[PDB]
Design a binder for this molecule. Structure first.
Ligand SMILES: Nc1ncnc2c1ncn2[C@@H]1O[C@H](COP(=O)(O)OP(=O)(O)NP(=O)(O)O)[C@@H](O)[C@H]1O
Length: 303
């Protein structure tokens, strides 16, 4: 039976926060960098503010609220933090600012400076995030490098709950999908594991596109034929065999997230044994003056 969901949904006054910069437009909506000053509190919290495309079509109001619902109900160091909503005219989603942006852009932009320690720690942290969702019985359904955010090079969090569901519920990123999901729209914790596999492959190839070329329509055929993504240059057979296990047809044959935490964690203790990166040993990885009161969202706790 389902426990009552007692998450608090915080409604925020438009006056409590100043926008500052656009971060990402075009696609569907507009995300700004900003600072949130709660009521009378004397803290300023860096935040991202997702005020969706001006037009207020009741269709997409229903979709930003579902995210808010999910994000308000999660609480884990490796899942993105929702501060609250603003009901202005178009619904504003207010999350913790993740200054380094999405992990896909971050690996793409920084290939030459990314060591094995970072790559494997990311793997461990993503698997922790996903394991936590598994404990809350959430199937994410859209895990990808584009949907993991970077608070710092050493701390990432899963984002984009716009397709999350409870395991069992009944209510398209084809290249990240478990075969049962493309064929039967079955979606399980184990189909999230498939997508973890792809996300890891995106990281290990420093942001390549999976099945670059092959059009979406061909994908399910390819997999039934038994083809998978190729071994990235930097990966030992050890790392790659974990990817491949995530991509087994038998869903229950795939690893569990808790096993993934364990395995990458072992590897993270000796990173150079597991990823082979040219120049590994030597790699290493805001605004205004009134910054006395700045507090990261992670240090701003609410009773
Ligand atoms: N909390 C955040 N902190 C910093 N940057 C963010 C944050 N949320 C989003 N962004 C940036 O804005 C981009 C677009 O945001 P997002 O709304 O996730 O993309 P989208 O294509 O509109 N939908 P989706 O990727 O499915 O969530 C992200 O990839 C980031 O570069």
């Amino acid at each position: 039976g389902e426990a009552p969901n007692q998450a608090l949904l915080r409604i925020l006054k438009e006056t409590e926060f100043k926008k500052i910069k656009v971060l990402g437009s075009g696609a569907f909506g507009t995300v700004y960098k900003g600072l949130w000053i709660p009521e009378g509190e004397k803290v300023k919290i860096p935040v991202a503010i997702k005020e969706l495309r001006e037009a207020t079509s009741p269709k997409a109001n229903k979709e930003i609220l579902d995210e808010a619902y999910v994000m308000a109900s999660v609480d884990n160091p490796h899942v993105c933090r929702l501060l609250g909503i603003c009901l202005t005219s178009t619904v504003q989603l207010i999350t913790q600012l993740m200054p380094f942006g999405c992990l896909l852009d971050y690996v793409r932009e920084h290939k030459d400076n990314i060591g094995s320690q970072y790559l494997l720690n990311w793997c461990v942290q993503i698997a922790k995030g996903m394991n936590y969702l598994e404990d809350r019985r959430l199937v994410h359904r859209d895990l990808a490098a584009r949907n993991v955010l970077v608070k710092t090079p050493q701390h990432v969090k899963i984002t984009d709950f716009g397709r999350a569901k409870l395991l069992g519920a009944e209510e398209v990123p084809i290249k990240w999908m478990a075969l049962e999901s493309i064929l039967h729209r079955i979606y399980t914790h184990q189909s999230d594991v498939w997508s973890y596999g792809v996300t890891v492959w995106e990281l290990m190839t420093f942001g390549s596109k999976p099945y670059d070329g092959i059009p979406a329509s061909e994908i399910s055929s390819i997999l039934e034929k038994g083809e998978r993504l190729p071994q990235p240059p930097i990966c030992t057979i050890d790392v790659y065999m974990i990817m491949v296990k995530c991509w087994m047809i038998d869903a229950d044959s795939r690893p569990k997230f808790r096993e993934l935490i364990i395995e990458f964690s072992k590897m993270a203790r000796d990173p150079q044994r597991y990823l082979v990166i040219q120049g590994d040993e030597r790699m290493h990885l805001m605004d205004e003056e009134d910054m006395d009161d700045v507090v990261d969202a992670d240090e701003y706790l609410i009773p």
